Short mmCIF file of C-alpha atoms in Angstrom, two decimals:
data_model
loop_
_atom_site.label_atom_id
_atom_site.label_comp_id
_atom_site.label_asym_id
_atom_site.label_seq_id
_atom_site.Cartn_x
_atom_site.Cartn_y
_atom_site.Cartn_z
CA UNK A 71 -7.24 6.26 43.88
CA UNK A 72 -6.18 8.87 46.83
CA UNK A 73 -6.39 7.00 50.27
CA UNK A 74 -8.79 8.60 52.80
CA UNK A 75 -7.30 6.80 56.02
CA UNK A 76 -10.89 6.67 58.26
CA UNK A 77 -10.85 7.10 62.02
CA UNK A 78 -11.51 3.51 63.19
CA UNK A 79 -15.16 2.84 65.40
CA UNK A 80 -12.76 2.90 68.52
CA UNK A 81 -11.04 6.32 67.41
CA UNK A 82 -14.59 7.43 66.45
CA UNK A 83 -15.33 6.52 69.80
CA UNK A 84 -12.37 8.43 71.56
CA UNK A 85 -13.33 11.37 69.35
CA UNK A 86 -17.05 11.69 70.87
CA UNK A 87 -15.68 11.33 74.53
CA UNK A 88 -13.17 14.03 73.56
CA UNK A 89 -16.20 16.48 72.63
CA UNK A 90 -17.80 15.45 75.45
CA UNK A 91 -15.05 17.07 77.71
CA UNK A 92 -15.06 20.23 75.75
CA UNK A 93 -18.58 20.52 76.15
CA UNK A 94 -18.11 19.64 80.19
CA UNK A 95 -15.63 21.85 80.37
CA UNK A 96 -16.78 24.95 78.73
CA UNK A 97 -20.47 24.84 77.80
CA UNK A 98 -20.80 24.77 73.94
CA UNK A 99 -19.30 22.34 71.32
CA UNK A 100 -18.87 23.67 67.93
CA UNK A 101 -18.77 20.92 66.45
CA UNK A 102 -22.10 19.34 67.73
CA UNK A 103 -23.51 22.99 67.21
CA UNK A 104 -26.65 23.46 65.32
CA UNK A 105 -27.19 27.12 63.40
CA UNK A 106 -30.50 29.07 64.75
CA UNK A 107 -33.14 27.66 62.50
CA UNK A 108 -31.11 24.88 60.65
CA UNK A 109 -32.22 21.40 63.11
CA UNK A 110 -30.41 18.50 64.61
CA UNK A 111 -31.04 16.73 61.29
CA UNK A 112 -29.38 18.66 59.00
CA UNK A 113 -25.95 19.18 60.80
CA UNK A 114 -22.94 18.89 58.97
CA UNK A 115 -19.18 17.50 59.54
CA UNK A 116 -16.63 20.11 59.09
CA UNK A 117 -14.31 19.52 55.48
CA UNK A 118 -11.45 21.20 56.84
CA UNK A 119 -9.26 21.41 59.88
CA UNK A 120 -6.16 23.15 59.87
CA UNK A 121 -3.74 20.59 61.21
CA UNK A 122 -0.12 23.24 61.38
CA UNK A 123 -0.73 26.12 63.00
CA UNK A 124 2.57 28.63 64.54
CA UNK A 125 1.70 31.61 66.93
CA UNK A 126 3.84 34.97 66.29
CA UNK A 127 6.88 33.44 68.35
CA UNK A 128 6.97 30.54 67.57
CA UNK A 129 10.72 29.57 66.37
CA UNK A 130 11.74 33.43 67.34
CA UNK A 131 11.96 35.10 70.88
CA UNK A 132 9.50 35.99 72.92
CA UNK A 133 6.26 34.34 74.34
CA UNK A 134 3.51 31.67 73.48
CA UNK A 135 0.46 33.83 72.88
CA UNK A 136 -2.33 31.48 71.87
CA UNK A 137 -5.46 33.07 72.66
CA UNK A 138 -5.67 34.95 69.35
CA UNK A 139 -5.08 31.73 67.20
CA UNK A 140 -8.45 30.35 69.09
CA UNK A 141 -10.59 33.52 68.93
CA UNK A 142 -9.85 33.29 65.10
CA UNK A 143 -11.16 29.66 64.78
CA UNK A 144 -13.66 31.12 66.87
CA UNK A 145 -14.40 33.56 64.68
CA UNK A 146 -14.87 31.42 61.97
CA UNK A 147 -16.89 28.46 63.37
CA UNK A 148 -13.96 25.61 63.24
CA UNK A 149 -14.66 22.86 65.36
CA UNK A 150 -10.83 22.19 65.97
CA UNK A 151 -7.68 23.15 65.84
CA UNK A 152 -4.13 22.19 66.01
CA UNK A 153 -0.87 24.32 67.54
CA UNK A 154 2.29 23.13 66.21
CA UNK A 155 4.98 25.84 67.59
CA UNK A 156 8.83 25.28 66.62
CA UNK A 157 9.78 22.10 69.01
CA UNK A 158 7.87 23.43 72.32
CA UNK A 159 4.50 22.69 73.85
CA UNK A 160 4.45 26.60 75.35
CA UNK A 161 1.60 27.86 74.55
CA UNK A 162 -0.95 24.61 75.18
CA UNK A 163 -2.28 25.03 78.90
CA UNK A 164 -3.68 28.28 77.59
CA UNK A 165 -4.42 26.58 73.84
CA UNK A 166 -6.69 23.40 75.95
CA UNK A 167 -8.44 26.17 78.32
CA UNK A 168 -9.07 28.71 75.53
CA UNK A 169 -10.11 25.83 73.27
CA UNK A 170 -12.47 24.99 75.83
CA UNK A 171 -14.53 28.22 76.50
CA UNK A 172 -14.46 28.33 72.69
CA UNK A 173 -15.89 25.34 71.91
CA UNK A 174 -12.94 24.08 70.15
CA UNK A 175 -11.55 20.88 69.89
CA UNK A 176 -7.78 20.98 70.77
CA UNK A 177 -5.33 19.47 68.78
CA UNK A 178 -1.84 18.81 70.10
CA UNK A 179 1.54 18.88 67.99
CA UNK A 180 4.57 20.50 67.32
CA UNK A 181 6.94 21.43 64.65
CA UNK A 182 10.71 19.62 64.01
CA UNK A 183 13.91 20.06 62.42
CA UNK A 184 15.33 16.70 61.57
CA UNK A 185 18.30 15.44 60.80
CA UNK A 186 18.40 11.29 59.16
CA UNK A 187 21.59 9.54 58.42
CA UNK A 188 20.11 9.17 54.94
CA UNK A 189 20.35 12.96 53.79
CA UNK A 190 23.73 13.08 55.98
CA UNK A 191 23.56 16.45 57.76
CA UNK A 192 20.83 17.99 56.24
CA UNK A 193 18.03 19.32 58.27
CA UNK A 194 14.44 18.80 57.46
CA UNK A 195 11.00 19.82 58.25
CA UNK A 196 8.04 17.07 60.03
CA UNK A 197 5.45 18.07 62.00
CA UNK A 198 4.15 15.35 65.10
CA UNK A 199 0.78 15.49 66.28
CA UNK A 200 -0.69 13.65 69.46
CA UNK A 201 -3.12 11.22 68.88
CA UNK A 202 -3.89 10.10 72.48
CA UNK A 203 -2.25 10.69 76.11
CA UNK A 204 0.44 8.33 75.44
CA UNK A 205 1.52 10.11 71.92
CA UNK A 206 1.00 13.20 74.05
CA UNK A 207 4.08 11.89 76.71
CA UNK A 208 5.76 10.69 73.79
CA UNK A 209 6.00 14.25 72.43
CA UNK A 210 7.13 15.49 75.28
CA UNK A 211 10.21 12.97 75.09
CA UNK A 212 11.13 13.81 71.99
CA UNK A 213 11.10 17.49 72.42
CA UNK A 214 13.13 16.95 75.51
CA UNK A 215 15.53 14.58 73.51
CA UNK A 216 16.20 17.38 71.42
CA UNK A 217 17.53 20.17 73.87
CA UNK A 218 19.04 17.05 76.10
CA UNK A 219 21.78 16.73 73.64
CA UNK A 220 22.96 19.97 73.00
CA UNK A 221 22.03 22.29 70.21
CA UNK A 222 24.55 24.64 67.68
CA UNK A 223 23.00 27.84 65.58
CA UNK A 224 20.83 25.48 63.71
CA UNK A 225 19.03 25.03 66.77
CA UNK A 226 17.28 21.69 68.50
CA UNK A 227 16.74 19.05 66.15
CA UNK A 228 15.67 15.52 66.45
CA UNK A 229 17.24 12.00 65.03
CA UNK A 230 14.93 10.67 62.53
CA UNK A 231 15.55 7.09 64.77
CA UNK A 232 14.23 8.56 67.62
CA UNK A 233 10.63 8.02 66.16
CA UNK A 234 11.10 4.70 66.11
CA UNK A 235 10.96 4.20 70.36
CA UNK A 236 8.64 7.32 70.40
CA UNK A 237 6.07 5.91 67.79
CA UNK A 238 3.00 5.50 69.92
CA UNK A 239 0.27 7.46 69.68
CA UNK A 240 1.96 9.54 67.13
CA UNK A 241 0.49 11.03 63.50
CA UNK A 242 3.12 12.78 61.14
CA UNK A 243 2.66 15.13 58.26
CA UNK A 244 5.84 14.44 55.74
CA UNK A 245 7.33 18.57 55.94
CA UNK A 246 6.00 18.95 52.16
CA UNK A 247 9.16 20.56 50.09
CA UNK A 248 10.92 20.75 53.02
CA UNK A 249 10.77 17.18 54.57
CA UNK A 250 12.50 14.61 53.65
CA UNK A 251 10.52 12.79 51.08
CA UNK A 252 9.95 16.06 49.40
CA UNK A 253 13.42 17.30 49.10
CA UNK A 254 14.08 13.94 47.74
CA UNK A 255 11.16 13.87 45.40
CA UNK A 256 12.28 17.20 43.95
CA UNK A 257 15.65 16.09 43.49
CA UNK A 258 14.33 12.90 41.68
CA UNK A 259 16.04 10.67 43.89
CA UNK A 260 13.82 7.96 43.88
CA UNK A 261 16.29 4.99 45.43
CA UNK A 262 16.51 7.74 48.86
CA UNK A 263 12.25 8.30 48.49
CA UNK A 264 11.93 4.20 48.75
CA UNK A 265 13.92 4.34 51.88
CA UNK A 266 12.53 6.86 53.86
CA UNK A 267 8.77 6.39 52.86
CA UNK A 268 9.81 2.36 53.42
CA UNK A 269 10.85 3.98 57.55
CA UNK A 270 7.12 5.57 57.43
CA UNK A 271 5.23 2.84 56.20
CA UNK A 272 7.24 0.33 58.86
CA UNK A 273 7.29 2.53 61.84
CA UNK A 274 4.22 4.58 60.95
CA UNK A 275 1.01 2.70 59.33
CA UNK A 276 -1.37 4.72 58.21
CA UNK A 277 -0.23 7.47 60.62
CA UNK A 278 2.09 9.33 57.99
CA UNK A 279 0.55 11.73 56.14
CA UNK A 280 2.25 13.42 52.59
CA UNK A 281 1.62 17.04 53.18
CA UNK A 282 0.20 19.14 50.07
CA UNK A 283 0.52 22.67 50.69
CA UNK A 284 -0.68 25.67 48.35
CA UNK A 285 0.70 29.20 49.33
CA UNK A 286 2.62 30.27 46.53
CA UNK A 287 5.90 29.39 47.46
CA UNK A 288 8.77 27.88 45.33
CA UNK A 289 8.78 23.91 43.85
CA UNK A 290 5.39 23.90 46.24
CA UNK A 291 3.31 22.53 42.81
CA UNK A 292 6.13 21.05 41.64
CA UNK A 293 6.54 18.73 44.85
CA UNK A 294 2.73 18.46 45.11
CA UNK A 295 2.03 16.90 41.92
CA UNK A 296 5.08 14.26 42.45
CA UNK A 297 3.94 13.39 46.18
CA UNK A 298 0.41 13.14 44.36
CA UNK A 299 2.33 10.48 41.73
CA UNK A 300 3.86 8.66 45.06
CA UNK A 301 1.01 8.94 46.72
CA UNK A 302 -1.39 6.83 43.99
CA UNK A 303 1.67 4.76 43.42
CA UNK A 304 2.22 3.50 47.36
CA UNK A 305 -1.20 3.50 48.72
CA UNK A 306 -0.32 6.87 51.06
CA UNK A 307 -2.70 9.31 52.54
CA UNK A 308 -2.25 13.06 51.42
CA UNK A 309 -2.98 15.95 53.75
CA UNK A 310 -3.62 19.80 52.87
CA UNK A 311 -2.32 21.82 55.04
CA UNK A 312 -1.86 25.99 55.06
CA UNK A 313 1.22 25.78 57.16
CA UNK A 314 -0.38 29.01 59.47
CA UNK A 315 2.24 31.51 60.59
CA UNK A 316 0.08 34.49 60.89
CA UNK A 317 -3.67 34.91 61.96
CA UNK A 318 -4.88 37.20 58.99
CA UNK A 319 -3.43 38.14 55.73
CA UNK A 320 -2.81 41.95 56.66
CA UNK A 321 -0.42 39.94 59.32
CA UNK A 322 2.66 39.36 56.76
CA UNK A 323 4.29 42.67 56.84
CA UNK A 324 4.64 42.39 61.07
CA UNK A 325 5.64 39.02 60.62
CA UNK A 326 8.12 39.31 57.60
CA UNK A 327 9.76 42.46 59.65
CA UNK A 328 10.05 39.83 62.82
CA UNK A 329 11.96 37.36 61.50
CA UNK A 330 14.16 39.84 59.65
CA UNK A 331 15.27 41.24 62.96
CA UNK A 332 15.63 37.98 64.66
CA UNK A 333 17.97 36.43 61.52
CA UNK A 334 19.91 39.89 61.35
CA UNK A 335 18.62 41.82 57.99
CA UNK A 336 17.49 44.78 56.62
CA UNK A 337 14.25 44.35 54.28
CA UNK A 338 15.73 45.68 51.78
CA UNK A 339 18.74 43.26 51.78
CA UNK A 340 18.60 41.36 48.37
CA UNK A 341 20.02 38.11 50.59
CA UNK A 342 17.19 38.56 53.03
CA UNK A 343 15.67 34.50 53.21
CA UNK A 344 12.40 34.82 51.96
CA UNK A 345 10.88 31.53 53.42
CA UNK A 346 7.27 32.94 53.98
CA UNK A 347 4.42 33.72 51.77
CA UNK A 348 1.31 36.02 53.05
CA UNK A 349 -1.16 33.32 52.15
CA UNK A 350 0.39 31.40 55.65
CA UNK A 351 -2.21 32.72 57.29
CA UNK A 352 -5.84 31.46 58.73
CA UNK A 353 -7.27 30.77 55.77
CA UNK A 354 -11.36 29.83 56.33
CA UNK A 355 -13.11 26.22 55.52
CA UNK A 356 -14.18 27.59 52.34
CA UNK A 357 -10.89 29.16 50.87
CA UNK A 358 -9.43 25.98 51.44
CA UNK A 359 -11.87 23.39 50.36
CA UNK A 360 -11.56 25.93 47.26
CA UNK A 361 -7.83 26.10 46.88
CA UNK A 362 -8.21 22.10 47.13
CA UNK A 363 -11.23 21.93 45.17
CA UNK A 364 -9.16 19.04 42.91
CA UNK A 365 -7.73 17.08 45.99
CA UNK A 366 -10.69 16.25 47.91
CA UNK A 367 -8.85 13.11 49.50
CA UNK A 368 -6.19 16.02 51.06
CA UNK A 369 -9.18 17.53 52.79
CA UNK A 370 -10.66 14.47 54.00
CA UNK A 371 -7.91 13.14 55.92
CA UNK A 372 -7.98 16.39 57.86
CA UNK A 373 -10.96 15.49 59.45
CA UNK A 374 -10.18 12.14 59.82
CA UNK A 375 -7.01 12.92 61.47
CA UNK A 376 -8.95 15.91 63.33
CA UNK A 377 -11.20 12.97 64.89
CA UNK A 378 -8.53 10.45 65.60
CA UNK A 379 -6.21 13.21 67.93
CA UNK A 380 -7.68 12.78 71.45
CA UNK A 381 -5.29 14.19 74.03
CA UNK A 382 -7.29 14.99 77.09
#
């Protein structure tokens, strides 16, 4: 019943000319990459791709260090790879050349606060990925939009209507518990889920994705197996996603101690936010073809999406 939204021929098509230029460009292709005695034959598609993906400073201070985000895929043999920092595009002239000499196809996306007339003020999480040169320029626009305007302590955000000019060449995942649909799927407001999956399915066919995410944070199942419900009910594609914030486990501590100093806390403040889990980080093919083991539709459309983002 889960939909696995295929790359068209034409995508497919875009895809192989967009391995062709890492290969051009750097000399190996991961993907395309047969083990030492395995054969041509018997080479196999990836099952996962990690399609949200923050470096250390991402929505804090400080810069856009990429290079260790791609030495990890690296390390681990993925054939691509997304970067979806906080509402900037810093880090992806070094992301495309690193990708490159890696082998790695580069994935190109970023990470939103939104704001909808339909959950009044509220802010809420959506990440945009580029699916071609046009999406790619679209992007751009829409993270300019949001520091045009002017910005308070909640920082840039974009109008949910601003999608609707910037469409083109543009693939969303939903925000999980934290996007719209979510927050209105664990509130069991059902009338507000029509409407804004209604905005998605007019504005974005088959290029919205519900994101299922596993990392042991709270109403994460709970929203997972209602966006599952939705999902079978609408005809919608999931996604699994790991939501990356840190490159390795042993990571958290460093990162939990970051964002403590940049929102103004001691650790051992009771009120400290607690909006990160130490499973946000890199987890391998395996783990998460494991943790999904039950979803295999959420994996799929990783690689489908993987294949349809061609920003050269």
């Amino acid at each position: 019943k889960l939909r696995v939204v295929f790359a068209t021929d034409e995508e497919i098509a875009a895809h192989e000319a967009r391995l062709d230029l890492v290969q051009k460009k750097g000399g190996s292709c991961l993907w395309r990459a047969t083990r030492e005695s395995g054969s041509i034959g018997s080479m196999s598609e990836p099952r996962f791709v990690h399609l949200r993906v923050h470096s250390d400073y991402s929505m804090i201070d400080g810069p856009a260090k990429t290079a260790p985000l791609v030495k990890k895929a690296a390390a681990l043999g993925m054939p691509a790879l997304a970067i979806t920092d906080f509402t900037n595009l810093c880090g992806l002239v070094k992301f495309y050349g690193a990708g490159h000499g890696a082998g790695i196809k580069p994935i190109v996306g970023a990470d939103f606060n939104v704001q909808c007339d339909l959950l009044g003020d509220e802010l809420t999480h959506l990440t945009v990925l580029a699916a071609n040169n046009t999406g790619y320029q679209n992007l751009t626009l829409l993270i300019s939009k949001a520091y045009q305007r002017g910005y308070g302590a909640a920082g840039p955000i974009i109008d949910r209507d601003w999608l609707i000019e910037l469409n083109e060449g543009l693939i969303l995942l939903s925000g999980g518990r934290m996007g719209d649909v979510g927050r209105s799927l664990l509130r069991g407001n059902s009338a507000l889920v029509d409407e804004c999956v209604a905005f998605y399915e007019e504005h974005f066919p088959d290029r919205y994705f519900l994101e299922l995410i596993r990392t042991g944070r709270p109403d994460e199942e709970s929203y997972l197996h209602a966006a599952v419900e939705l999902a079978e009910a609408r005809g919608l594609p999931v996604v699994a996603t790991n939501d990356v914030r840190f490159i390795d486990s042993s990571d958290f501590d460093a990162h939990e101690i970051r964002v403590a100093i940049h929102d103004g806390f001691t650790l051992d403040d009771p009120k400290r936010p607690r909006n990160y889990s130490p499973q946000q980080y890199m987890r391998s093919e395996e783990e998460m073809c494991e943790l999904f083991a039950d979803i295999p539709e959420a994996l799929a459309n990783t690689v489908e999406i993987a294949k349809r983002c061609n920003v050269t």
